[PDB]
């Protein structure tokens, strides 16, 4: 058997295009304080972000529809996302070490996966 769980999670930036019409994207964000970055903390089962299959907890949102969010505040990030229109083009980059500082008892294992004890 060949298990995905052993393979490294790609750390390069990716483009994700979510088509969600006029409903929520279906994920949570954390961060935004002092340019620390905006990270995905939670993806809703069955929501547009889940259906894309291309975002995960620990992804940093680098931009939405060309709008750089690397140094965004949490509220303006949310506004940017909520008002991005029916087609939402996200550049994301997996940053589990940075993300893990937000969630209690969390750490990164050898494959780059976020583990919570």
């Amino acid at each position: 058997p060949e298990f995905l769980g052993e393979e490294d999670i790609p750390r390069e930036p990716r483009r994700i295009v979510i088509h969600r019409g006029s409903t929520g994207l279906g994920f949570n964000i954390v961060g935004g304080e002092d340019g620390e970055g905006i990270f995905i903390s939670f993806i809703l089962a069955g929501g547009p972000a889940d259906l894309s299959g291309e975002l995960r907890k620990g992804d940093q949102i680098l931009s939405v529809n060309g709008v750089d969010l690397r140094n965004a505040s949490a509220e303006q990030a949310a506004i940017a996302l909520k008002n991005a229109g029916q087609t939402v083009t996200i550049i994301a980059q997996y940053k589990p070490e940075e993300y893990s500082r937000f969630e209690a008892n969390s750490r990164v294992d050898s494959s780059g996966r976020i583990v919570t004890d």
Binding site: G24, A78, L81
Partner: peptide
Amino acid sequence: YKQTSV
């Protein structure tokens, strides 16, 4: 700290 659903 701040967390929001989108």
